């Protein structure tokens, strides 16, 4: 892709997402999702390898299906109230209908089978876009309609996502699959609190976002695609594995490493809502994410692994990428636990 | 709510179910796709005309002109998956097992 073409392509993806967050009209919301899909596919189809074609086809089919399924829900709302604003919808069927359509585009419930595969086929750099920036617009809409959400449906979506997020990640070796399954588990964590408090959803959003680029772009700098390939990073770049391990520890949510901040506040907010079995279950199964987190952390920095003779060649040369925004992302995703009362800023 | 109003609604449901399960062909899958928007275009059209929403008549045509961006991108993906694998058969999309 010509850089000018690629830059404008990214630009409308951001514009498509941005339009969603700033549009009162329901129709404009569907437009923003439509533009986002319209330009997400070519970014995935940048490498032009069969896995990318597989992933783009899966992503398009599930996203387009949810897009027009979303459009159907709006029409029913129009059918029963004649409105177009995003305040609180007026038809219980439309509530579930759009909740299903919005949720599928996040890949949390059984509507998540695309997420592990779509990120697997496509390149790592485009994966960062898919699991970070394409996850704000549907969440933005959900926060706006959190008043009319159905708790029984929504929390069932949260439980399954965390359960599948941990269980799926335990059995994967391709670190791209690890990230997606971890992302799904994180998505269930944030998605559980919308009926209770949208502000805690936002905080879970930024912390999860910064964490993903921290992990993904560190993976970019190491230039690794499997756990075995990540193992050799200790020999060439010992430093990279050192911060990469502390990011994994934070990703589990062990204090004082920030990343425990969302889980902590999420538990506290639901506890105020007399929901106390629910926080315990997700918190208990949150340890499942830690197991493959430690497993990845184990064979990257904690224990050195058999390197290769040709690895001596890599030592002589140096990285050319300027790894922009990598350093402050690590610190902002590993030490900001003492600065938790910034929750008021989001409100 | 008149009989016809949900004659489109089920038509959308049948179109949704047809897209929600693939038989053997990606083109046939795509056919249910813009079939769903056809009912979606149709269903919106009765609402706006019946309610005399004099300014919402915008929405149908742009509902079609934007569903086309899906369709145009839709087959253009299939032409890619049907020139490497040769066949539009969707069971050949399992190459991403691992």
């Amino acid at each position: 892709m010509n850089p000018i073409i690629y830059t404008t392509l990214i630009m409308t993806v951001m514009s498509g997402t941005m339009l969603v967050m700033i549009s009162s009209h329901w129709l404009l919301i569907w437009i923003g999702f439509e533009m986002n899909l319209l330009a997400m596919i070519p970014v995935l189809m940048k490498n032009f390898n069969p896995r990318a074609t597989e992933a783009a086809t899966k992503y398009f089919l599930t996203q387009a299906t949810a897009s027009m399924m979303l459009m159907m829900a709006i029409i029913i709302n129009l059918l029963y109230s004649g409105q177009w604003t995003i305040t609180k919808m007026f038809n219980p069927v439309a509530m579930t209908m759009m909740t299903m359509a919005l949720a599928m585009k996040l890949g949390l419930s059984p509507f998540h089978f695309w997420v592990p595969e779509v990120t697997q086929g496509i390149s790592l750099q485009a994966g960062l876009l898919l699991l970070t920036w394409q996850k704000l617009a549907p969440l933005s809409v959900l926060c706006q309609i959190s008043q009319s959400i159905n708790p029984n449906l929504m929390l069932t979506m949260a439980m399954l996502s965390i359960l599948i997020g941990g269980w799926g990640g335990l059995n994967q070796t391709q670190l791209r699959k690890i990230m997606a399954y971890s992302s799904i588990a994180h998505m269930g964590w944030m998605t559980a609190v919308l009926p209770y408090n949208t502000t805690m959803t936002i905080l879970n959003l930024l912390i999860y976002i910064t964490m993903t680029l921290a992990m993904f772009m560190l993976l970019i700098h190491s230039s690794a695609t499997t756990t075995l390939s990540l193992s050799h990073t200790w020999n060439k770049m010992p430093v990279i594995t050192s911060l990469m391990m502390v990011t994994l520890l934070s990703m589990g949510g062990l204090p004082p490493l920030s990343g425990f901040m969302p889980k902590w506040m999420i538990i506290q907010e639901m506890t105020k809502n007399e929901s106390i079995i629910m926080p315990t279950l997700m918190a208990m199964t949150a340890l499942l994410n830690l197991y493959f987190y430690m497993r990845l952390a184990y064979s990257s920095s904690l224990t050195m692994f058999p390197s290769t003779n040709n690895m001596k060649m890599k030592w002589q040369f140096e990285h050319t990428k300027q790894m922009k925004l990598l350093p402050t992302m690590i610190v902002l995703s590993t030490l900001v636990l003492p600065m938790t009362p910034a929750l008021s800023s989001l409100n | 709510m008149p009989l016809v109003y949900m004659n489109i609604i089920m038509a959308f449901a049948i179109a949704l179910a047809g897209l929600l399960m693939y038989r053997s062909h990606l083109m046939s899958s795509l056919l249910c796709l813009e079939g769903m928007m056809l009912s979606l275009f149709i269903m919106s059209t009765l609402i706006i005309l019946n309610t005399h929403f004099t300014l919402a008549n915008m929405m149908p045509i742009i509902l079609l002109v934007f569903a086309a961006c899906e369709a145009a991108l839709g087959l253009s993906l299939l032409v890619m998956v049907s020139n490497t694998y040769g066949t539009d058969y969707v069971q050949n999309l399992n190459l991403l097992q691992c």
């Binding site: 490498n47 390898n49 697997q120 086929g121 499997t226 | 691992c98």
Partner: peptide, 11 residues
């Protein structure tokens, strides 16, 4: 099952 290829390439 087989591990994926390393470069992801499969008139």
């Amino acid at each position: 099952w087989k591990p994926p290829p390393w470069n992801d390439v499969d008139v």
